[PDB]
Amino acid sequence: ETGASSNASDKNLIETRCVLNHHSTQETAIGNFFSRAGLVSIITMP
Amino acid sequence: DPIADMIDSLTALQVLPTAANTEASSHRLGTGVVPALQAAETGASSNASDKNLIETRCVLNHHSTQETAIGNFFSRAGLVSIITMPNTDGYVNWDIDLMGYAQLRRKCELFTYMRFDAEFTFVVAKPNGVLVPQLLQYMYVPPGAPKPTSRDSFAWQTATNPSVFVKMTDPPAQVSVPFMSPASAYQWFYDGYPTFGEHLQANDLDYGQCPNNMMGTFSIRTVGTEKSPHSITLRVYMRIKHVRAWIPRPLRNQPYLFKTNPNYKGNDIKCTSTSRDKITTL
């Protein structure tokens, strides 16, 4: 009800191991999300 | 600590740009030292050399080992697909499976696992080889994305899908493709089933199918709304770059039959060697 999202993590709910992950966050940046050519118009001269 | 039992590779790499030199040797007579007698049951290859079996001279040879490196063995464009638009409504959806042509398939299946970047070249012409001014569009459809249902489908808007627009009188198109498996390598051999459940005889096609190699759909079309009067023939070629390979395998001695299984014709088993008449006469 406070409008805040949950702050519970993996380590506080279950017993976890150590994971060193190197998954990049580059592709979900909005520059990479939008820099793709898409169709905006089709113009015809009959 | 009250509990005392809770307290708790063989070889390395070397750079060898040339083949090995030969040292000079003389005769040898004695007991106890027998380098020619081996034991093949240990699983080890023979370690006997030239200098221990015959009398040798000194040879300083500079023969390079660069061409047999697996980067030079694989960086050659080979045919992986032939797509035709005689499929009479002006578009083809082709499911990406690069095991349909025997020459590149036998080279890649020397190893079990492989991780590489690719380079795809699209050589397009008419079925007799003539070229016409005609605009085409190639689109890569990843798994989960909507595939086109007609020539004027909404999926050709390609707002996020990567797409190439090209003409037939142009040079062939080239793109670079990264390593895009969810695993750490591609495997040409997957011993098992993808899903759980019972494995009955009607679902025996599932055996050997790895979804980590399924990369989606490659779609082509002629761009305009109206029907084109030209027949299309597209040939796809693939170079393998930045390659790593694991676990060598026996090379196949039987002709291929299907794209997804190692099935072989059982009535004509080919012998690996060429036969002769007698063991004493060559």
Place this chain on the structure above:
Amino acid sequence: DPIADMIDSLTALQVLPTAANTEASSHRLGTGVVPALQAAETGASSNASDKNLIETRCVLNHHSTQETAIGNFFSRAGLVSIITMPNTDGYVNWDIDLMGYAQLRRKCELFTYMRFDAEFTFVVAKPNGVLVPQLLQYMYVPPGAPKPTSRDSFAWQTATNPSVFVKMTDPPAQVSVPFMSPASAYQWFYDGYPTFGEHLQANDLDYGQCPNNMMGTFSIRTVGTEKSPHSITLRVYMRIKHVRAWIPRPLRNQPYLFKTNPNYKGNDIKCTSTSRDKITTL
């Protein structure tokens, strides 16, 4: 180390020779500090004292806590056996089970586990209490040893078994017996079965029988080859020394029926208290 997760009591004793002193206290008026309100649901006993509920004086008391120590509570000889030789061939083999008399049984069953040394006294007379010049022999037969089958058996040679020769006109014999269980304590309650297998209704007698408490056979005889004309009555008394006890239990409020089980008469359940007529009139 490449793997990081493979790297990895409340109270104490005090000597209290006397009971606790009382401090002087005065009145107390205020909010927030309520030592009289408790919470019995936590499983903890109340920690409220004299000085927080009433106004007290200073009392320096020197009442000793020595007699309620479990060494003083248990070091008293109580009856464990009555053996009679009217058994008409001059010997008795008695299987050692000390749970046949209710007074020492209820004291020992206050705890679950107990580890002690013992001292056994043998008070022997005629059935009417008269004493005669008569030689007797008591032998302890450990489990596995041969027990005597007659008055002139070979087992009375006692070459390794401990034996006492005594006369009836002598003082009573006393011996010291160590702690001889294969476990670390004797248990008066064993919730389970000794052996494996199926547990059918015909083998329900096995429930509750611990072989760690079974100590063997106590044998008596008159020494001579010929028959003695005197009847014998032997009373055995046991003191408990060097005692350690664990896990207190509820004391039994029902009369005992058998020596090996907690069975009780179900048609006459005794209430623990003495009844009255009204809750307001004592």
Place this chain on the structure above:
Amino acid sequence: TIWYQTNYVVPIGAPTTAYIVALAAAQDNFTMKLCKDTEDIEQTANIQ
């Protein structure tokens, strides 16, 4: 799956049926890759 551990207990005067709202998000080790076309929007007819 969600199960009853004990019952839904209620006194007199309060309703015997309640409702649960489920909310979902991602953690801080969440990533995505290989950006592609979605399949939720379509366009069969021309817009405007």
Place this chain on the structure above:
Amino acid sequence: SDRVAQLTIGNSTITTQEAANIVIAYGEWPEYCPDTDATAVDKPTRPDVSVNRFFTLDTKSWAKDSKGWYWKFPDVLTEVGVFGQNAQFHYLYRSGFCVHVQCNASKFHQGALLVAVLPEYVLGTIAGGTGNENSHPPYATTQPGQVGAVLTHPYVLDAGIPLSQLTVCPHQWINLRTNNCATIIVPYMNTVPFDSALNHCNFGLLVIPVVPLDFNAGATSEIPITVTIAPMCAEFAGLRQAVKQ
């Protein structure tokens, strides 16, 4: 704000908002067996996550004339999960427990349960009624499994010992106006460092309604009681083929 609690062990979590303290039985936490107390020479196995986790048993129904229930440990878990498989393939076992009993009701209900742990709970019979039969309890009574059994004479605890001094054992209450749960952490208690899991029961858990359940007509009449348990430092030794009993 100590009325809220969270118990996390393994891949399981219990949350409660209406609680008393946690009782640690005899002031001792469960431990592994040290080298000075051990006697068996083979190396024991410690699975440490697949066996040390919360296990939820079947659910009882508290009626207005309920007598009480009991469970036997570790007999409740000898057919459940990876703990039940390690207890059948091995000859020796050793572990402590964390017992959690749940019972919620509204603010217009009343009643009180006594939740106690009694080690070496040996059961008796009524001796045929008249006291002349040397009767013995059946195998379904002494080891009832994960379902549990009902007490016939709860005033003498079916063993000739009174309920009124059962609070000399580690215990809690579930008073319906105060809390809805009880939590006892039990160490390993035996005369031997290891024992059999199929032949011997270390302790029994007793849940008896001392004050009976009461409510007015129109409120919820289905008041259930759930028991959730967790092994703590489970060790197993003496590996051989699987033996069920």
Place this chain on the structure above:
Amino acid sequence: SDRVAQLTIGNSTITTQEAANIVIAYGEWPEYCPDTDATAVDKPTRPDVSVNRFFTLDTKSWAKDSKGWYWKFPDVLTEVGVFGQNAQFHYLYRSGFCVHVQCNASKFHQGALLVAVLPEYVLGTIAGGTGNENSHPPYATTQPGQVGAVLTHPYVLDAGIPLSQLTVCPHQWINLRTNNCATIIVPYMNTVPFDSALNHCNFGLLVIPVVPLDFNAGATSEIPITVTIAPMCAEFAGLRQAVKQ
């Protein structure tokens, strides 16, 4: 005096007096998964004695016209012991293996077996004989269990690849005049750090008689072949109810 060997792991010991070396496949010993290569976040279980021990399968009979046998790993052990129970209760598994094949005969017998380990041994069919049917091998063929299966066309290894270059894989020979056993230690080989034990087989063990068995009439004609295997660094993760297949 390196012809004698002793392999002790768990509560099991193998002795041999007529042996070659031990082959360590690709020069690598089995290991647990490090933190840099792992992806799953839950803590795995490592039983370390009850699963890392020698397991003896059924025994074959070497005749004078035997084709060969194969086994699939870890499919041979998914119903055996505590390893077979951890593989059913968990979703992910990871381990290496120590394979030991035994075959003894007298000094008047002759014959040679090739004992090889082939990772990702995918089987083919004869495609209906004529090559026109897209046939697939049945489930009893691709995963034969602890019994194993017989090779139909051993010259092409039932997969279209020749026997003559099977020695590019980690292998040993059992030559009856020289030794009576073969030992290969295999690490974990996959494209993923953990995988399913019921859906995926890492490698296959092939035992093929290259030189056929021969003896004169009057000697012992019952020459058996026994396979004994041991997991080495077995890990399990993803605990859930038991799934058999």
Place this chain on the structure above:
Amino acid sequence: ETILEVNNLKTNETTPMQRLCFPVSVQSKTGELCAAFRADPGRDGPWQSTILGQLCRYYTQWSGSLEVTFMFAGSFMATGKMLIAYTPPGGNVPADR
């Protein structure tokens, strides 16, 4: 966090505001299940109504941990205990608690 449509029934399609909450009631038998759904954020089902399940559809592969939050909207006078389980792959919905 955005709302998960666990109550995505075919009878709810003409009154679609009921798909945002699922009921909980007084039971007669013990250990019943209230709801069951898959934990796949990019699959068709209850995860389609979330902004995480909508932005996943623009990508091909995903990784990482998820979270589901359940909020009880009953009376102050109502009590109860629920068991919310997550099962790794290998089987169907579990038959009992």
